[PDB]
Symmetry: none
Subunit: 189 residues, 2 copies
């Protein structure tokens, strides 16, 4: 184990696999302090632990993750329509990481490049983290509590926030918007 | 032919792959009479047609289906529910085949072995063709016209049918139930 491989290359080629663009899309993922992660980028010791979990979590090819040239799978768009989306569960205002969810590109008229599939009470909300702010259902963070709320833009850089509890109004600097719900799947038990 | 191979064991492993607990479910799955399935078990010839379709539909390992060597599934589509579902469009009370839809088995709490993904009025309805008759939202055929209606079982083997312009009641022999909606997806543009 010293075949002359690049750590930063594997760490990035791992990002393409998952389908990331930012390095913050890793630190919290494996629950490590950003400082610990920069260390992984610094030292030449390959993060085999991430390569393995990436191979397991995203299904991406291990051979490719460590070397290759483009023998992973197909994340650029709809492989065969497949399309993987990072998954979560939202319960008691806490967002927890969970299994990736495979879903057809036909579910979205607009490509969902930076999405989240969130399980919350018999429904799976598909969220676009890159959505421009607009009226609609959104995944938000209010003082650390994560929830899905209907937002309505108001003049003066304000928002009306509804759902969960009695509605209220605040400024866009008062709550954090995580992404817009672009689709919802509901089980009919 | 290649002696040793047990047609009985192949058919039972095929049932195992689909998650069927009773032989009648397999007959239903392949649209044959129960007595025809019994003949398949009694005869010496292997059911390669069913094994092949089982492989294709569940992703089960062919070698295992035919010999029992190894294991049914490794990791993906493991046991499952639905990965690729036949797709259709329902418009003007006419149902037309369309391209299949790829969906995660995680969409269904209960396995979905004989499903349909129906695009109707901007939503995608996931239907279980094998569902037992029970109150709920159903894909039905009323004198040839196809629609999705809420059914309520009534005493005397009758049904209350709602969802169209006005509701009506009839016997279970007056309309054809095609399958029960177990999930619905809608884009929230």
């Amino acid at each position: 184990d010293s075949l002359g491989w690049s750590n930063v290359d594997v760490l990035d080629r791992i990002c393409e696999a998952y389908g990331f663009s930012q390095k913050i899309q890793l630190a919290n993922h494996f629950d490590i302090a950003s400082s610990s992660l920069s260390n992984r980028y610094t030292r030449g010791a390959i993060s085999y632990d991430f390569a393995a979990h990436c191979a397991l979590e995203t299904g991406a090819n291990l051979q490719w993750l460590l070397t290759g040239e483009g023998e992973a799978f197909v994340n650029n768009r709809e492989s065969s329509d497949a399309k993987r989306i990072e998954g979560f569960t939202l319960s008691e205002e806490i967002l927890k990481s969970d299994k990736q969810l495979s879903v057809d590109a036909q579910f979205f008229t607009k490509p969902l490049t930076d999405g989240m599939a969130i399980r919350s009470e018999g429904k799976i909300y598909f969220v676009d983290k890159q959505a421009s702010l607009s009226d609609g259902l959104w995944l938000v963070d209010i003082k650390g509590a994560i929830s899905i709320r209907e937002l309505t833009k108001l003049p003066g850089r304000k928002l009306h926030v509804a759902g969960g509890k009695v509605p209220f109004e605040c400024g866009i600097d008062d709550i954090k918007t995580l992404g817009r719900v672009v689709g919802v799947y509901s089980e009919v038990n």
